[PDB]
């Protein structure tokens, strides 16, 4: 081989699309999660008080 | 250069760190002696207070 | 009678009672309920109210203790005597109460619970009860004075 791969060499835009939404939707999806989680924390503060 | 850019910053920061000391303080030792009244929540919130 | 005393080694731990449809009885206290036929209704905990409820028989339904959030400032009874709501807080004269009293009623001059205590702290000539209470909007909130105690 003339040249030398670089273990980015393959995975192209379709299965960098899929790695990045998938990440991404966890993502989201955990801060969604944890969104709730605080508001519910500050709700009750006010709820209380 | 570092030096006098680091021991400004730090005898800025202290100041500045003392004056917002000193500026809670002053928005909370009001509420602090009213066991009762309702707190503006916008000043309960940007200065610490329990609020009721 | 309308409020039962949960056992443990034959020395009641825990009054829990029935509230406005749901046995409630305190997560800290471990015993047999006194009355069979709530003795093994599976209980919902809720630890944010250290609490547990559960839904009385069909059957005996109709027994069971009204409440409601509109709490004035005055006097309400309870079994140990008379409880004052002062600067939303009840408080208790000293003395009266402690490990046993957990979960016992407090109730108005109609009858109906507001609340139901879970702990104490002696303060001075008098004592402030950390309880479960209705909120303005008929919300349940847990109101504990600071330090306060499992009963």
Known sequence: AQHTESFTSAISATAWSWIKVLVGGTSAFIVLGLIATAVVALVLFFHRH | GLCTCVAIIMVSCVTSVWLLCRTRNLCITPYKLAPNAQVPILLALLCCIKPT | ?151
């Not at chain 3, 004052?84 to 003395?95: C, L």
């Open chain 3, 1 to 151: 009678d309308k409020t039962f005393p949960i056992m443990l080694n034959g020395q009641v731990n825990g009054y829990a009672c029935v509230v406005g449809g749901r046995v409630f009885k305190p997560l800290h206290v471990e015993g047999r309920i006194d009355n069979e036929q709530l003795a093994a209704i599976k209980l919902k905990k809720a630890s944010i109210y250290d609490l547990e409820y559960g839904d009385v028989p069909q059957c005996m339904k109709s027994d069971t203790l009204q409440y409601t959030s509109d709490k004035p400032p005055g006097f309400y009874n309870w079994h140990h005597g008379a409880v004052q709501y002062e600067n939303n807080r009840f408080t208790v004269p000293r003395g009266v109460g402690g490990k046993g009293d957990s979960g016992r009623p407090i109730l108005d001059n109609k009858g109906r619970v507001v609340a139901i205590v879970l702990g104490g702290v002696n303060e001075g000539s008098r004592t402030a009860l950390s309880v479960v209470t209705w909120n303005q909007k008929g919300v349940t909130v847990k109101d504990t004075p600071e330090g306060s105690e499992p009963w």
